Design a protein around this ligand. Structure first.
Ligand SMILES: O=C(Cc1ccc(F)cc1)Nc1cccc(Cl)c1
Length: 186
């Protein structure tokens, strides 16, 4: 099946807890895969304009590890619940992808999660201005604009709204698309 095939692909790239004890400032993100209309999608947030770090940017759900978290995956799930109302029974964490090093002292660990079909986002407006889906296949043929660094523009056909996706978030989206969609019979 589509979902069993996606999980099987993802597991081959799982690094697990290999880098998880290193003494960094630690953040996790959840890359949430949603199946709709017979295709996989990624769920993104738009950060609230009131946040002082990166207001109005497109990001995956996530945030800083805290002492309650059993592990890095727990960080991702706790933050996703706070930001968009995703409950732990509504997500299956499939793997941990390559972590992202930033600012010399920070390590961001991305987890891919399969999201239940009955989940409906409840954006928390203190943190999230918007939540939206992008089909995973978009990231194989994105609409690129150069600002010099590459920016993806995705227009939602439901409503005509264009979102800019860039940086780590864009990079991770492409990675997941490659992992899941490469070398597939039609
Ligand atoms: O904060 C994140 C994930 C993230 C962590 C570290 C990082 F460097 C880059 C993204 N995500 C988020 C998305 C919406 C609202 C809020 Cl409050 C947080």
């Amino acid at each position: 099946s589509m979902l069993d095939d996606a999980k099987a692909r993802l597991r081959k790239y799982d690094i697990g807890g290999k880098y998880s004890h290193l003494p960094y400032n630690k953040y996790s993100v959840l890359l949430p895969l949603v199946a709709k209309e017979g295709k996989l999608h990624l769920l993104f947030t738009v950060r609230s304009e009131k946040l002082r770090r990166a207001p109005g940017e497109v990001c995956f759900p996530g945030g800083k590890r805290d002492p309650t978290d059993m592990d890095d995956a727990a960080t991702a799930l706790r933050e996703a619940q706070e930001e968009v109302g995703l409950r732990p029974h509504q997500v299956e964490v499939v793997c941990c992808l390559v972590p992202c090093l930033i600012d010399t002292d920070t390590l961001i660990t991305p987890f891919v999660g399969l999201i239940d079909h009955n989940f409906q986002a409840q954006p928390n407006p203190a943190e999230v201005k918007d939540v939206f889906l992008v089909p995973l296949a978009y990231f194989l043929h994105p609409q690129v604009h150069d600002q010099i660094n590459h920016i993806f523009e995705y227009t939602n056909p439901e409503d005509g709204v264009t979102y800019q996706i860039k940086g780590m978030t864009a990079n991770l989206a492409v990675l997941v698309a490659f992992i899941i969609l490469e070398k597939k019979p039609t």
